[PDB]
Amino acid sequence: MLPKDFQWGFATAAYQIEGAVDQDGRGPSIWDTFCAQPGKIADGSSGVTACDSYNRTAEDIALLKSLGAKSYRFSISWSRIIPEGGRGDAVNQAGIDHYVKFVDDLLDAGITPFITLFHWDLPEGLHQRYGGLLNRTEFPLDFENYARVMFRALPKVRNWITFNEPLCSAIPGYGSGTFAPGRQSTSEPWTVGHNILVAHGRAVKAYRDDFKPASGDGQIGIVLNGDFTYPWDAADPADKEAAERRLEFFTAWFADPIYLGDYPASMRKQLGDRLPTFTPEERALVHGSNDFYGMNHYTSNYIRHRSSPASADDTVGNVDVLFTNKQGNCIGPETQSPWLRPCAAGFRDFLVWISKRYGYPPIYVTENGTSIKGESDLPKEKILEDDFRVKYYNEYIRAMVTAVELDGVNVKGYFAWSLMDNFEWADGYVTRFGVTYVDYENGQKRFPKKSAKSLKPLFDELIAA
Numbered sequence: 001m002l003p004k005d006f007q008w009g010f011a012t013a014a015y016q017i018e019g020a021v022d023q024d025g026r027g028p029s030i031w032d033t034f035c036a037q038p039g040k041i042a043d044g045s046s047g048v049t050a051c052d053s054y055n056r057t058a059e060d061i062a063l064l065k066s067l068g069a070k071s072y073r074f075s076i077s078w079s080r081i082i083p084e085g086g087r088g089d090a091v092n093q094a095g096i097d098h099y100v101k102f103v104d105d106l107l108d109a110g111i112t113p114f115i116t117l118f119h120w121d122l123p124e125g126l127h128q129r130y131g132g133l134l135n136r137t138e139f140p141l142d143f144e145n146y147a148r149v150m151f152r153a154l155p156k157v158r159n160w161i162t163f164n165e166p167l168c169s170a171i172p173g174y175g176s177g178t179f180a181p182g183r184q185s186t187s188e189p190w191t192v193g194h195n196i197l198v199a200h201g202r203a204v205k206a207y208r209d210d211f212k213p214a215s216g217d218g219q220i221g222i223v224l225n226g227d228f229t230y231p232w233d234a235a236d237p238a239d240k241e242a243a244e245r246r247l248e249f250f251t252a253w254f255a256d257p258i259y260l261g262d263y264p265a266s267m268r269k270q271l272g273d274r275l276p277t278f279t280p281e282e283r284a285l286v287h288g289s290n291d292f293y294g295m296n297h298y299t300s301n302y303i304r305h306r307s308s309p310a311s312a313d314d315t316v317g318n319v320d321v322l323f324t325n326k327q328g329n330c331i332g333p334e335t336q337s338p339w340l341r342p343c344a345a346g347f348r349d350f351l352v353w354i355s356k357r358y359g360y361p362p363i364y365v366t367e368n369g370t371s372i373k374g375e376s377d378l379p380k381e382k383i384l385e386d387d388f389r390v391k392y393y394n395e396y397i398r399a400m401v402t403a404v405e406l407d408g409v410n411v412k413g414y415f416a417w418s419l420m421d422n423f424e425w426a427d428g429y430v431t432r433f434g435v436t437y438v439d440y441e442n443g444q445k446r447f448p449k450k451s452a453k454s455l456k457p458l459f460d461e462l463i464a465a
Contacts, residue, residue, distance in 0.1 A: 004465035007413035009071035013119040016422040020054035024094040027083025029121035034180035043428035068456035071112040075119035085123030087145035114159040133192045140199040147203035151211040160220040166196040186312040187274045194276040201285030223294035226251035228346030232304035233326040242305035242319045249317035259358040261287040296367035300346030336371035344395035351403040369417035389451040
């Protein structure tokens with residue numbers, strides 16, 4: 001049994017699905033720029049058309065009703081709202097009107113919106129003007145303004161997310177250079193993470209002070225990813241330590257400041273002066289800034305300690321991240337994503353880890369899902385019979401249930417990533433995470449896969465009353 005008010009649905013992100021990249025006054029994001037650069041996207045694609053969801057809102061809502069979703073998690077493209085991005089820049093009324101209409105249409109359908117303000121698509125103008133996410137002074141001020149514009153425009157919304165997966169904005173974006181804006185630095189990821197946390201805190205303070213509804217059901221929080229860890233050699237205290245330290249670098253990086261008031265000591269030890277120090281003002285903003293814990297989770301790994309000190313290029317916490325352990329056991333089967341091996345037990349375990357470290361917060365699992373190896377090469381009929389994905393959902397959802405029932409974890413909602421196949425960042429369109437097939441060659445036509453239909457009967461069995 002899950003509580004009667006448990007919310008479930010599907011998730012998407014604006015740049016992954018919307019298309020219409022220059023329609024109705026939209027300014028370029030750092031992702032539009034990145035895709036234009038050679039060798040960044042595996043299939044040489046971009047979000048130019050994607051699923052054309054910007055132009056197919058009625059169809060997307062009808063699909064959500066068809067599948068029985070209670071809620072829908074999606075993001076706002078900042079550059080549709082303020083094309084240049086800053087607090088002194090012109091606001092694009094057309095972009096605001098689009099999202100206002102969309103939210104109205106969702107609520108008229110009886111589906112609750114869960115809205116992400118920042119899903120990696122920083123307006124290119126802010127990146128050029130002042131170094132974007134790198135600027136400790138300017139980025140938080142412009143993010144807060146953007147947040148205020150959206151809070152003011154969408155007063156019927158009750159569920160807000162500031163940032164989706166800041167680790168992905170920071171490490172791939174400024175560490176390895178694999179995601180936009182494609183920079184490579186031993187310091188920049190830590191600078192970026194800090195500015196995101198401050199930006200987040202400013203936005204939450206603005207929400208709480210000036211916009212939260214009298215009805216009291218308004219809530220705001222950040223969304224953090226994090227895959228679970230198991231020691232390579234469980235009998236080696238060093239591997240136990242290494243597995244814990246890995247979680248700290250992945251997730252506590254963000255959640256420790258938010259719940260506990262500072263960065264993980266292990267990060268401070270390794271990173272030294274490369275990791276910023278909160279001022280009293282910044283700590284006041286960041287400490288206590290989550291009304292709920294937003295959780296993205298996909299996989300687990302075995303973690304092995306290293307015999308030497310960490311290098312400056314290290315971002316994982318000086319450990320080997322592996323798919324096999326000392327006994328030759330394997331985490332899970334291959335998917336199309338080299339990093340993703342299904343391991344339902346790790347989902348239960350991650351929920352408990354968060355709960356124990358952060359005082360049993362209310363948790364929304366804002367992303368969970370899988371790709372299927374070679375899915376895009378399959379004939380249509382075979383893509384639609386996505387048994388691998390059906391099983392992924394069945395097992396992961398049951399693991400979540402175990403965490404709720406036995407471990408007492410306070411899970412409030414669950415969102416399947418994704419409602420439809422979409423632009424999977426540096427993978428392009430080859431990697432499919434959708435419960436819905438999208439035939440990009442034939443006008444982005446949609447076809448629900450087996451997994452899309454499987455979630456309602458599953459949740460109807462679980463959700464009480």
